[PDB]
């Protein structure tokens, strides 16, 4: 025989035509399993134990261990929180993705001149050590005695890099508190380059008790390029900077997870943990930092590497080829043409307040009342329409993505099936051709029993088997025996 | 011969390489035809003869036959209209899809206390029977004598289901009419849970004559969950509820069509009618309630089940295999991975009015004039920009969808072609191999004429044909004849 | 032998399983190269040498050579500019695509009656010949002495086509200039059909020095259909029309490029130049006017048309088939189902101005101040949110498109590979079958050396080669020789 030795407990592979045909020895192609831990090499992984990237940026009193810290990849934990002044970031997502892509928190201190104000404002919700305090990159300027002049400061950017400037605005709870910190009964912050300006004004209002405060701080940012100048004008409710952060650009990012940290080596990091990158595809999660297999939607793709399992029982002899190299060639096609994700970036504004106008005569007395009421309602209408729209965009965004994955997974399944069908037909044809080549060489001594194996009527020593293996055979030795049988 | 019996008037199938090759007996794979009628089983189909789902909800006087009605699927007719008070629904589409997905109009009456108002407001455009009337789920409260107090009512939800509350607001034609129904010269409706509030105000204005009215009613809804409370405040122009509708969730929906209703059995309902679900794909329409074949863009996919049609003429004998099972296996691949549609939901607002401010001093006299004019124009700008945006979204939405269908149809065509090519090669190979197996058995008695059939030189009775069929043949019987011919 | 004659310097083709296998004679399938020039036949190509389509429309003094000009395709140059009054078009893109799709600039003059105004306003930035001038389709009406009445004019459309009416509004630099041209200290333009109205008001403001003017003109359009009427009301800052343009619809468009113009014939025009349309796919650019090959992302797809290159050395004889027709059949599949692009249309508004309210008492004094300030900031907020949204839409738009191309290119690569694999297997099988048919005919005279060629032991004249070619051979002639060798 050449009967492929009846390998026990082989497995299923999909083909284009038949389904669940069985093969001698199969390979899996979707690494579906995770240890649950992130290696500490060869990447530089940084554990934000109880802070977020924003809180390390601002300088939280319990994250002063992250100062001038250098990451390849930032990991946020869910068990993180703020233990400082309660704050707010309009377009939070955009700021975070900028800081994330930089890969550094190198903070370079600068010489600002705050004439006619008191520096280093204190809070009891951000006690640094035993006494009152605040964030470590920001200066909370208040009135110096009983005056607050218009802070008008300038800084040219003369160097060969871009500077990132972080600033904000204070929202009081009552007008009394407003006057107590800032002599003027309303504030204004103007931040200008040669290419942009943002003017914001405080919104005095009561908000829920959070760590014993009903006031809030809104955080804004500005990006100055080599050759530009920045000009900060204000007349109250200003949180000044004390420097700029050095920007780079490259391969750096951020991933949210609750996985531990180990001492292995792995380059392929997901929120489920480390994945060996041997396989072409992985089913574990979509987000992949480093170099990773692409994402399919299925649990098993079995790529076949040898024969169907034909027999009742084994018989020794020579045999033909094995699938060998073919795996990386096909891998080439689909690897080449698959994409990288479009990154959910905008998310949403997610505002939760009544932002109407405030005066009894203006809003609830006379024709003017109705107008102002109508204006606020019109804006509410606008806001709700806006949310509807943004939601619809994000819904569509999801649909596109899901469509993509499906179609690629269908392609992947078809391709595996095509290879297995071809592979089966290749090996089958080779065996059949070789067997009948042997039949023409046999010269009537033996006959196939029907399972692609020759029933030999006579015996012969290993010399005959060698002669068959080299295709140099003559039938004279068995002439007398065959004639007697015939 | 084994000449496959020359089946007359076979048909075309697509292959990957050749086109319009012909086969013995072909199958169609796209059920393209409709009776035009909807079966009344096994689904519960409800015919909205002259009402829409919204009109059955509100309680139209000529659709009181739909009270506590239970549908699996709702069908709207185009010949439907309203014969009651002219009305308006902001975000009409959202409300309808909610009611549609429920599958019920179980209306549970509740005990509201309307102090200091007159109940059961009348209209001559909604005459119930012979005298004036209104909708059957709503209470039109008006002034009781010469007073209208602030209606402030509360209802806790103590049960184990969510309640759907339907309410509205009255838009008069003139301020005189406003004062005649409501002592206050302006109205306001505040509807609040622990999780939301909507404050709307009437827009006094003249609108086109519709069934003898220039006034309009705007319809709004609120969704209260187990444990919550609702608080309705108003000071005029209020259309109160009289209860809540019991919500479910499951498999229920709505489809617009002008098809009749029969007494067959069919589970696959489209706006063209009932479709048998035998086939894998259908070309009839995209929307499909129940279990239906997927949608392709082509008129015929012919999947092949047997040989090419080779001969000049027939000759009897045995023959080999037929395609058999293969159809459901491949069906598996593409069924598995195809998607369900993303449902056009938002559509558009589709507002058609001038919604500007109104005062001669405020809008057309002085600097104030210019400001107010500028504000209204700015809002008009906003509205038009909004429409542009929404339109662009919906345009893109269409493009995505069309792209999807094409790509899937291309996949479907490729897959059918792959199977037919393989199928042809499978059968062809089997015949050729079997024929030459027979040739080696023949031992020189007959010779192939060139059409995969043996020209036999001698005659022989059915014994010889049986001996050939079982592959147990010897040539001794025809030795003398063959020698004489040779 | 039948050894396929060892064709020197054949090339690579991709297969599904093996990669970079070699074939005798290969064909390329992506026309990747351009001359750099646009043919002047058979299409009517029009060269906008120093004007854009908008500037030819308005009647620029240096593009009076484009009057009643007829194009199949419009080409804009980058070296084009305006040398007339500085202007502005809100939704510039929409207007341009309308004019582009028409294919004509037939301007039909009409009889307007401008009572109580002075016609033919002059500018020194649009000097026509040696003296002051303006655009050639528009009438700049100013005050006649010391009065400016309300221009209220009407025109019914009684004909069997739609009319395109082009008009505008003047934005001054100072109120003094406003009063000097228009007695009223503010203007207003109302343009109404039975189906729409646009009321715009001038925005007095200083803007950058452009060719010695700080004033600007905003250009608007209106589309009147057969049976309608148009009514233009104004009280200042109005740029009147002098006629309508005849609309068509068909196959006409616009393409931006810096290519020269030749005297060849080509129907397939891209911004890189003319492309012969022989091939199925092209890699040159995406935009294609006329009939063109579809766009793939790859540099070479090699479709195979004959054998692998097997030998050490050649030997003469007959041979089998060649690939022939197969190319257009497969071309059919993918041509059929590919799409045409979704046309970037909206682009963006791209506004660059501070459009706030203006009064010292209204904006910077008292509670009113804060309100007005808040309103302008709220609108700025709205504008920025709008831009964010539009940007996100256009970003997504890009992503969809890129996804599409990839997936199609992957399909194209797979299809080429499938054909080449099949083609190789087809030819290989045919040769092998024919060779062993010849072996059974040989009757022991010759034996294959191992390269699909027969080593012949004896000699024989061309008679033997003919006898082999027709399959009518007997071994008697070589009996004595073979017996002696044996
Ligand atoms: C946090 O980072 C700051 C800034 O330095 C930056 O981060 C460091 C870790 C390194 O990566 C630096 O290359 C990088 O710029 C550290 O500030 C550094 O402090 C020293 C001591 O004050 C500075 O030396 C001074 O240099 C000036 C300028 O020549 C002299 O005039 C002084 O006499 C003195 O020699 C050093 O230059 C400064 N780095 C900068 C601005 O170049 C800081 O120590 C570091 N650690 C913290 C806060 O944890
Ligand atoms: C429309 O529906 C209402 C509400 O009932 C609901 O729909 C029915 C068709 C059934 O599906 C009900 O299970 C479902 O809740 C019908 O109202 C029903 O009316 C009867 C008679 O008034 C009520 O019986 C009363 O029950 C109360 C509470 O125990 C007693 O105090 C009374 O003495 C009396 O026995 C019945 O409970 C009520 N269903 C409800 C609220 O449970 C209504 O008849 C029906 N038909 C219409 C309008 O066409
Ligand atoms: C630019 O185009 C205008 C309008 O004509 C249009 O374009 C032409 C090139 C042709 O394609 C026309 O078929 C097309 O309508 C040209 O105006 C044409 O001018 C002549 C001479 O004034 C008009 O003839 C008159 O017709 C009227 C109406 O019957 C008589 O009352 C007059 O006595 C006279 O015969 C001709 O009709 C008019 N075309 C129109 C409106 O039908 C213009 O010459 C041309 N060239 C420019 C500006 O370069
Ligand atoms: C790896 O860790 C991630 C993060 O915990 C796991 O993601 C989670 O996967 C489950 C799948 O059932 C998600 O549940 C469902 O999500 C859908 C929306 O995607 C929602 O409609 C359902 O109601 C349900 O919540 C879960 O949200 C998701 N969590 C995330 C994204 O934070 C993932 O399963 C883990 N994988 C492995 C192999 O451990
Ligand atoms: C089943 O019934 C539906 C509903 O009547 C039929 O749908 C209709 O199909 C035609 C196809 O020509 C549509 O006409 C064209 O629609 C496109 C937009 O899709 C438009 O650009 C063209 O100007 C033209 O109107 C028609 O709109 C569409 N009607 C709908 C959706 O209500 C369908 O053809 C019927 N199918 C069969 C097999 O009877
Ligand atoms: C045909 O002419 C067009 C127009 O000049 C050429 O298009 C240009 O192609 C290059 C490719 O490198 C583009 O450069 C890159 O574009 C991307 C965005 O697509 C941008 O992110 C990169 O920073 C870089 O600018 C270039 O923009 C593009 N120009 C256009 C569209 O006007 C095209 O290459 C020419 N083709 C041939 C074969 O000559
Ligand atoms: C079945 O196929 C797998 C393919 O992974 C074979 O696994 C190899 O096993 C040898 C040791 O026997 C390792 O040195 C190789 O690295 C493994 N991988 C590869 C790439 O071949 C396995 O041996 C096969 N089993 C049988 C019975 O043939
Ligand atoms: C507020 O700040 C700006 C920028 O620092 C000042 O404008 C500069 O004023 C100086 C002195 O007159 C000029 O030499 C510069 O050319 C100005 N620069 C720019 C960019 O305008 C402005 O004077 C300051 N205003 C006040 C009231 O202090
Ligand atoms: C051609 O193929 C069709 C396949 O649908 C055959 O149709 C079958 O016909 C028999 C009766 O002759 C029915 O009992 C089957 O249910 C039909 N369907 C299937 C699934 O086979 C048809 O008979 C074939 N015709 C010929 C001449 O072979
Ligand atoms: C309007 O309605 C609300 C809710 O029913 C009333 O608020 C409740 O008032 C009672 C009596 O003072 C309190 O016990 C409740 O705690 C209040 N509930 C809530 C949710 O606020 C309110 O008093 C009513 N106002 C008027 C003027 O009648
Ligand atoms: C290799 O294939 C190409 C296919 O384009 C052959 O090109 C043909 O060449 C002849 C002249 O020899 C022209 O008349 C044809 O129009 C060409 N095109 C086609 C469609 O066949 C080329 O001759 C082939 N070379 C060899 C050596 O066989
Ligand atoms: C401004 O123009 C409109 C339209 O030309 C005038 O309205 C028409 O007036 C005439 C005379 O009274 C009527 O016969 C028409 O029926 C009106 N048409 C429409 C569409 O309203 C209007 O009179 C003009 N106003 C002024 C002040 O001149
Ligand atoms: C291998 O397969 C046989 C099938 O009968 C099964 O009984 C056996 O348990 C398998 N493997 C082992 C664990 O012996
Ligand atoms: C079957 O095909 C033949 C082709 O010649 C045609 O004449 C005949 O009409 C067909 N069917 C019938 C209706 O006889
Ligand atoms: C053909 O291929 C051979 C490979 O050795 C190369 O040397 C030769 O230069 C090629 N063509 C020509 C230019 O002679």
Numbering used by the authors:
A (entry chain A), B (entry chain B), C (entry chain C): 14 to 499
What's in the article?
We have determined the structure of HA0 after incubating it at pH 5.0 to a global resolution of 3.95 Å. The molecular envelope is wider than that of the neutral-pH structure and extensive rearrangements have occurred throughout the molecule. The membrane-distal domains are dilated and rotated. As in the cleaved HA low-pH extended intermediate, dilation of the membrane-distal domains results in a distance of 48 Å between their centroids, compared to 35 Å in the neutral-pH structure. Refolding of the interhelical loop (HA2 residues 55 to 75) and part of helix A leads to extension of helix B from a length of 75 Å to 115 Å. The extension of helix B in low-pH HA0 (residues 50 to 125) is more limited than that seen in the extended intermediate structure of low-pH cleaved HA (residues 38 to 125), which is about 130 Å in length. The trimeric structure of the membrane-proximal region of HA0 is also opened at low pH and the C-terminal parts of the B helices (HA2 residues 100 to 125) that form a tripod at neutral pH are straightened but to a lesser extent than observed in the low-pH cleaved-HA extended intermediate. A striking feature of the structure of low-pH HA0 is the fusion peptide partially folded into an α-helix. HA2 residues 10 to 21 form a three-turn amphipathic α-helix that is positioned at the interface between two B helices and a relocated 30 loop, burying about 65% of its solvent accessible surface area. On the basis of the similarity of the extended intermediates of cleaved HA and HA0 that are formed at low pH and of the proposal that the extensions of the central helices in HA0 and cleaved HA are likely to involve a common threading path and mechanism, we have interpreted the structure of low-pH HA0 as a captured intermediate that might also be formed during the conformational change in cleaved HA at fusion pH.
